[PDB]
Design a protein around this ligand. Sequence first.
Ligand SMILES: CN(C)[C@@H]1C(O)=C(C(N)=O)C(=O)[C@@]2(O)C(=O)C[C@@H]([C@]3(C)OC(=O)c4c(O)ccc(Cl)c43)C[C@@H]12
Ligand SMILES: CN(C)[C@@H]1C(O)=C(C(N)=O)C(=O)[C@@]2(O)C(=O)C[C@@H]([C@]3(C)OC(=O)c4c(O)ccc(Cl)c43)C[C@@H]12
Ligand SMILES: [Cl-]
Ligand SMILES: [Cl-]
Ligand SMILES: [Cl-]
Ligand SMILES: [Cl-]
Ligand SMILES: [Cl-]
Ligand SMILES: [Cl-]
Ligand SMILES: [Cl-]
Ligand SMILES: [Cl-]
Ligand SMILES: [Cl-]
Ligand SMILES: [Cl-]
Lengths: 198, 198
Amino acid sequence: SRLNRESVIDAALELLNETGIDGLTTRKLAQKLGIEQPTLYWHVKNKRALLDALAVEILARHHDYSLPAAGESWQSFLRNNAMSFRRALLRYRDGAKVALGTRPDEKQYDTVETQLRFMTENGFSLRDGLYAISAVSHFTLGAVLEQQEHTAALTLPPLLREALQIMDSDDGEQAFLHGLESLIRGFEVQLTALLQIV
Amino acid sequence: SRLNRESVIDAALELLNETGIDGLTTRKLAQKLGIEQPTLYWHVKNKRALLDALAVEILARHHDYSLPAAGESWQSFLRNNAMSFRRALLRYRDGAKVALGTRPDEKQYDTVETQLRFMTENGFSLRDGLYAISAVSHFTLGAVLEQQEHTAALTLPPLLREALQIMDSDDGEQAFLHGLESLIRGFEVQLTALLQIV
Ligand SMILES: CN(C)[C@@H]1C(O)=C(C(N)=O)C(=O)[C@@]2(O)C(=O)C[C@@H]([C@]3(C)OC(=O)c4c(O)ccc(Cl)c43)C[C@@H]12
Ligand SMILES: CN(C)[C@@H]1C(O)=C(C(N)=O)C(=O)[C@@]2(O)C(=O)C[C@@H]([C@]3(C)OC(=O)c4c(O)ccc(Cl)c43)C[C@@H]12
Ligand SMILES: [Cl-]
Ligand SMILES: [Cl-]
Ligand SMILES: [Cl-]
Ligand SMILES: [Cl-]
Ligand SMILES: [Cl-]
Ligand SMILES: [Cl-]
Ligand SMILES: [Cl-]
Ligand SMILES: [Cl-]
Ligand SMILES: [Cl-]
Ligand SMILES: [Cl-]
């Protein structure tokens, strides 16, 4: 079939949903695409290059709240950005594990730059703007990885018995949205404080 | 050599540091222990059982701040507990990835139960006590996984150029400790607020 980049990635995402990350391999991708392995090699050199590319495309395709809206508060931006990120990572099996193993590529350069500019434009130091954005990223990745790794390993004292029932009410969206507000407020308190002891 | 549980786990942790998680296998563990694979099988049925056991032992061996000190505030406990957890996960290559794929086993039952009791004893609902503890866990796991997955994939616009230099000052300990305070304060604001709009 077609072996342009878009088509290769489509097939690889499809395979990722079928196999998970650990079971994703260039060999199986070749089969999915009806080609021989050396033909695939011309296009895709190894699994690492594949994964690097999938991370980028997962977000490009599905992380639709990369940038602040006109007039938007930084609180609101961070909330909307976290929810978008989380959505995009949940979209494919092992999506968060695919995203972990990567740094921003060129075309994300400009998206993350803007986000850091925006933070600095709202009273954050580069560093604190960065810590904020990274805390949100880490919290979100950590939380998605625990849904996704939960359900992957699948295939009592009373409070805990009940915590584990409450912790399975929904997918983790409640505990995530609650924590996200906590984190944002925490940032706000810090920003506000300037040099006052806080 | 000796194939009691303790000895098997010691060798497996040692192998984990040598190979990483993806490259850890029962076959290689057998070799490390100078035994044949079917001999290992008697003791260790597969990689999943191994990993389950490693997660438990990583924390048992190294997560030394599982419980609040007498008189300790819940703020302080959460801080000390997060720092302990983080330390323990960083101790072995792919430590956080090893921890992800697991639920508390029996002997952790009582440790996590206590922690949730303690939260409830300090004014939290079970649920909020739970969200707090899980937000901390997810933030910490997310942050460690990003150190560990960073260095594993290894083997510019100006703000970002500089964010990436600042983001490599230390291992991630600064950005983690900063975010942790933000998260704790966020929790405190929530607890304090009771039913007031906040
Ligand atoms: C979820 N958001 C907060 C960010 C985001 O919106 C994007 C995105 N592509 O639109 C990211 O790449 C993020 O989701 C994201 O994963 C990256 C992350 C950050 C700070 O920027 C980086 O370039 C970078 C890095 O190289 C290593 C670690 C970390 Cl935490 C980062 C910024 C993230
Ligand atoms: C880092 N700490 C906050 C906790 C902790 O001290 C321990 C520990 N063994 O001492 C945990 O197991 C923790 O580090 C930990 O990883 C678990 C975590 C929690 C809420 O309890 C659970 O039993 C549980 C679960 O089954 C699934 C997801 C989550 Cl987030 C959890 C509690 C964690
Ligand atoms: Cl075709
Ligand atoms: Cl075409
Ligand atoms: Cl083609
Ligand atoms: Cl294309
Ligand atoms: Cl390969
Ligand atoms: Cl011996
Ligand atoms: Cl002995
Ligand atoms: Cl023996
Ligand atoms: Cl033993
Ligand atoms: Cl196996």
